[PDB]
């Protein structure tokens, strides 16, 4: 029997800062126990200061990103070159995804950018288009390895102030882009150690009011 779906592995990570957002993903593409490519870009600049990644089945991922990029193009045509805001992009992606509710894009989508107040924004989608604005979201193979670490190190969960013994929580102080990138790199280094589908390279797209910037880092290739 023909199985229209596949699993291309990969892990992605979106983190919203105070006036920035990062969307990171490993560059390894796989099927089963084989490596297809050590560098296959997975996070894409879609224009209007929005970055996107649709992780999971790469054919559906590429199709969705392609259709969203196309939606940005036609949004400009139809609405006098108006900038597509991140919230508007998010609602639009819900409809793209739910349009195939009974034959879903087998992907976990994350977009990142800035909201209309200039604050960092990350949106997270399930395969059929349920979505939410989030501060922190890992997706894909090693998501279960990364999220607990982020709960602890970004949101300071289970951390209390020494001397109070559980009475006062560690205060949620804002992280800089350099601080976030450290946590992203350590998340992917740790995921590479313990997950076979994670490795080769890490590509991070950083979104600020100045635009989209890229950073690349080597990961272990075993």
């Amino acid at each position: 029997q023909f199985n229209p779906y596949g699993d291309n592995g990969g892990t992605i990570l979106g983190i919203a800062g105070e006036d920035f957002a990062v969307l990171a993903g490993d560059t390894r593409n796989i099927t089963d126990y084989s490596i297809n490519s050590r560098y296959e870009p997975k996070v894409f600049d879609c224009g209007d200061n929005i970055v996107m990644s649709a992780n999971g089945f790469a054919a559906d991922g590429d199709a969705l990103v392609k259709r969203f990029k196309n939606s940005v193009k036609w949004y400009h045509f139809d609405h006098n070159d108006k900038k597509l805001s991140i919230n508007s992009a998010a609602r639009n992606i819900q409809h793209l995804l739910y349009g195939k509710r009974f034959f879903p894009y087998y992907v976990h989508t994350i977009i990142a950018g800035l909201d209309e107040d200039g604050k960092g924004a990350v949106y997270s989608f399930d395969p059929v288009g349920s979505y939410e604005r989030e501060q922190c979201r890992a997706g894909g193979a090693a998501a279960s390895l990364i999220m607990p670490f982020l709960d602890n190190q970004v949101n300071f969960k289970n951390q209390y102030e020494p001397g109070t013994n559980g009475k006062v929580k560690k205060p949620l102080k804002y992280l800089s882009v350099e601080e976030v990138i450290k946590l992203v790199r350590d998340s992917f280094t740790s995921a590479t150690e313990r997950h076979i589908q994670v490795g080769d390279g890490l590509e991070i797209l950083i979104v600020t009011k100045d635009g989209v910037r890229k950073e690349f880092y080597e990961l272990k290739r075993d």
Partner: protein, 235 residues
Amino acid sequence: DRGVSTFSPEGRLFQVEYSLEAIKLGSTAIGIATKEGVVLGVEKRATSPLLESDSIEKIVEIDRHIGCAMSGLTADARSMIEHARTAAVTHNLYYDEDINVESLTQSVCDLALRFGELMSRPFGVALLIAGHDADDGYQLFHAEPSGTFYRYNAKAIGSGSEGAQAELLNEWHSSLTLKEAELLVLKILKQVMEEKLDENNAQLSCITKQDGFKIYDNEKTAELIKELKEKEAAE
């Protein structure tokens, strides 16, 4: 006979040109755009004193930020309004935002030339579409059955239009207040109307960023009419 989509020797569509004649027979509608809001006003023109005039609905809400006034064969406007409302609501569903006044207007005007041998004839009604969005502020558009729409600082349509437009030419300036616009619509409506203008045979409305689209009470308009009479007697 001859095609419904036929060009005249001058290069104009017969049916579109004839629908424009029907609009000339319609009751007057006036729009004035200011930096404090856009005012829409209409002549109700009840055919008999037994007709309950508050059932005459020639000013209509499309969305919270977009209103619309009509002139001509007003029954034709109902499907245009339905489309406009659907377009406004659909865009909000797809994009989690208000639709641009121009985009709404363009969507309405796309229906216009969908006639032939689609509907059997053009619409016999003109629309003044007034609204506000964050990108272009307060806007007033004139949507015709030709599919063409012009943006206006002020515009009059219907039977008293060329007399009213000449009046709007002299009166409009870029510093008009909302209150000044209200009185100006009332003044020009009173000029071109056959019957004597009051709160029962004329209607006012406005669109502001804060309160959105609002049709004025007859009591509210009656006060503005009294304010108009006194300031005209003031010189």
